[PDB]
Copies of this chain bind each other. A is one copy, B any other.
Amino acid sequence: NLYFQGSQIHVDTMKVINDPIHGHIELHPLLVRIIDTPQFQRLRYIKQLGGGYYVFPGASHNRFEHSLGVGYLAGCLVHALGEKQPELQISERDVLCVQIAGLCHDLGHGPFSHMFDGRFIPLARPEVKWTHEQGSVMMFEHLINSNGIKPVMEQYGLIPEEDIYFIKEQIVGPLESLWPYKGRPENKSFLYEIVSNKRNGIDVDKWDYFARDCHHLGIQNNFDYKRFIKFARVCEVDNELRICARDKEVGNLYDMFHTRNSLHRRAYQHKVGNIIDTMITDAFLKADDYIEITGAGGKKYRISTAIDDMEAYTKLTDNIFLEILYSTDPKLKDAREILKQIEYRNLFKYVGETQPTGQIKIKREDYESLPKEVASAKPKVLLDVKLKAEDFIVDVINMDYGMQEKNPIDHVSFYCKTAPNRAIRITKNQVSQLLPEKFAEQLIRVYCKKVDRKSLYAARQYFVQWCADRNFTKPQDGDVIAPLITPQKKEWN
C-alpha cells in the first residue's frame, strides 16, 4: 500500500536465522524451500565429526548447520566479488545457484560422515566406487524431483535444466570427459572455485568448518576468512576469469593449510576418535545382513545398499547406531555387543604410531597385509602371550595439503597493489625458508584388540620390532614401551 515513482512497493521479507558462527543470516525463499524438505533436514541427524563426539564432547554438531554456513559463505563471496567488479556480470541467478550448491554439497553424507564413505562402504562393498559427493548429486536430484522445486526455481529467474546441471558440477566437478564444464562458460570460471575448489582447495567449505569445528571442539581457529574475502579479486588467468589473492596475503594462505593440517592432527585423526569410527564400522558390518530399510516401491535395502536408492538413503542416518544399540533381535547380538563395548569404554588399545622413512609410500593395495606383518615380527622379549594377525589393527592415514604431494600455493594466482588486474605467481622460495619441505606424509597407527595388560605389553614389542624391520621411524615412546627392542636399530641411535 505504498508507492514510489507511481509503482506499488512490494515488501518481500526474507527469513532470518541465527547461527553461532556467522550470526544472523538471511535466507532467500528459494533456499528456504530447498531446506524444508526431508532430504535436507536429514542432515540434522548426521554428526559432522562422526565418532569425534566420543572424544571431544563439544563436537555434537551436525551436517545441517554446517551446510547452512557453507551456503551463506558462498553467497557472501560471490556478492563481494560482484560488488567490487560489476564487469564480471554476476547475476542474482548466479548468486542463488552458488548458494544452493553450498547448501547441498553435503547431501550425500552417510552415518557419521567420513566414516561411512571412508571406512564402511569400502569394506562392505569393495566392488563399488562411492563418494559422498556422488551421493550429494543423486540426493540433490531426488530432492528436486520429490519436492517440485523446478517451478520455484523458474519463479526466481533460474533456468532449471542448465542451473541444476551447474549446481551438480559445483558439487562433484566435471560430469563428463578444453573447458570441461557446461553449466557456465570460461568467463565465469571463478564461480566453480567457490564451494568446492578442485584446483587448489581454497573454498568456503573449509572456511565454515574451520570456524564451526573449532567453536565446538574447544580449539581456536587462526585463519581469517573475512580478511581473505576483502582481498579477493577476479583476474584473467589462461583465458579464464579466476579468483586471485592479494600478493602479500600469501603467508596467510600457507597458514590456512597449516591450520587444516593441525585440525586433522589434533582432532579429526585423533587416535581414539579413529578407533571409535573403526568400532562403529565393525558393528555396522556385523549388522548389515539383518537391518532392513524400506526404499522406493517398498523394496528392501541394507545399510550397504541404501546408497543405491535415495528414498532408502534418506532414512539412513546416525539413528542406525541407536537402532543397533537398542535392538533385541539375537541376530544383532554381535553388532550390539560392539556398541556396548563403546559405551563401557572397553575400546581397542592404541599401541603406537610410526611413519615411513625414505621416499617410501605404503600403497593402499598393501593395507590389508599389514596386521599380518606385525604379528610375524619376532621380538627378542620374553612374553606371556602370543598374538595373531587378527589381534592387530593397522590404520594408515594420508596427511597432506589437499593435493597429494603438490603445493597448493603453486596453483594460486595473486595480484599486486600497483596492477590489480594482472595475475601473477609466487613460488615457495619467494615467501619463506621456514615453510614445509614436503606437502604429504603417512601416519601409521597400530592398535590391539586384546586389551589386558599382558597382551598390550606384548603388542608393543611386536609393533616396535615391526618398525625396526621395516626401517620405519622410531616411535616417540619407543625406548619406554620397548626398551629391549630399540637398541638393535642404530639408525635410531
Contact = CB atoms under 8 A, between A and B. Distances in A.
A95 to B, nearest CB: 14
A90 to B, nearest CB: 13
Number of copies of this chain that the complex holds = 4
Interface string A213-241: 00111111110101100110000000000
B429 A473 contact: yes
A60 interface: yes
A259 to B, nearest CB: 7
A362 B475 CA distance: 39
Contact of A436 (B17, B36, B436): B436
A261 B340 contact: no
A218 B266 contact: no
Nearest to A85: B9
Interface residues of A, number: 105
A477 B416 contact: yes
Contact of A87 (B9, B230, B262): B9
Contacts of A431: 476
Contacts of A60: 60-62, 65
A433 interface: yes
A1 B36 contact: no
Given A222-B220, A230-B26, A481-B416, A476 B247 contact: yes
Contact of A326 (B2, B315, B345): B315
B222 A20 contact: no
A91 interface: no
A215 B214 CA distance: 12
A396 interface: no
Interface in A181-233: 215-222, 224, 226-227, 230-231
A227 B24 contact: yes
A39 B60 CA distance: 19
Interface stretch (A128-136, A373-381, A417-425): A417-425
Interface string A301-336: 000000000000001010100110110100000000
Nearest to A259: B222
Nearest to A47: B60
B222 A219 contact: yes
Contact of A481 (B38, B418, B429): B418
Interface in A333-349: 340, 343-345
A222 B429 CA distance: 26
A32 B220 CA distance: 26
A19 B227 CA distance: 11
A410 interface: no
A107 interface: no
A435 interface: yes
B432 A441 contact: yes
A56 B399 CA distance: 35
A221 B219 contact: no
16 contacts: A18-B217, A20-B215, A32-B345, A38-B343, A60-B60, A60-B62, A252-B266, A319-B326, A322-B322, A424-B476, A430-B476, A433-B436, A433-B437, A433-B438, A434-B436, A437-B437
Interface of A: 1-2, 4, 9, 11, 13, 16-21, 23-24, 26, 32, 36-38, 41, 44-45, 53, 56-58, 60-62, 64-65, 68, 87, 215-222, 224, 226-227, 230-231, 247-248, 250-252, 255, 258-259, 261-262, 265-266, 293-294, 315, 317, 319, 322-323, 325-326, 328, 340, 343-345, 355, 357, 399, 414, 416-422, 424, 426, 429-439, 441, 473-477, 479-481
Given A261-B434, A434-B441, 7 more contacts: A19-B57, A251-B266, A255-B262, A355-B432, A418-B480, A430-B473, A435-B436
Q: Which 7 A-B pairs have the closest CB atoms?
A: A20-B58, A222-B222, A20-B218, A36-B345, A416-B477, A4-B87, A57-B65
